[PDB]
């Protein structure tokens with residue numbers, strides 16, 4: 001779903017608690033891919049130590065010019081997030097499965113079509129179905145429905 005950037009604790013509000021959890025993933029810890037998406041504030045897809053710094057800047061009042069407090073609307077099934085669930089996104093899921101290519105933190109949730117926070121082989125097959133129009137919805141959401149231009 002559209003992930004609130006900055007809210008790492010999952011209370012809904014941007015707070016100091018979020019920073020403490022974000023810090024620990026960058027020091028030594030792994031979170032759910034959903035948290036990873038929320039952790040990527042700058043929108044490069046990677047949870048950088050820069051992300052905690054900008055979150056800290058937002059908290060301190062220096063300036064958190066990233067997606068902090070906004071919702072990351074990623075195109076559901078679109079890992080590169082160009083607005084199209086395309087065949088290269090499909091390639092990326094299979095890259096994780098093969099272990100040949102790494103996807104960035106936020107991209108790990110963007111690729112997670114089923115919403116279990118794991119890039120498994122089922123996501124790969126959900127994208128199979130989504131690209132071929134077999135399923136109009138992914139468990140994580142869909143972008144066939146455009147709101148303006150429903151159909």
Ligand SMILES: [Ca+2]
Pocket residue numbers: 006007008009010011012013014015017018
């Ligand atoms: Ca919070």
Ligand SMILES: [Ca+2]
Pocket residue numbers: 039040041042043044045046047048051
């Ligand atoms: Ca980032």
Ligand SMILES: [Ca+2]
Pocket residue numbers: 078079080081082083084085086088089
């Ligand atoms: Ca794409």
Ligand SMILES: [Ca+2]
Pocket residue numbers: 112113114115116117118119120122123
């Ligand atoms: Ca999955």
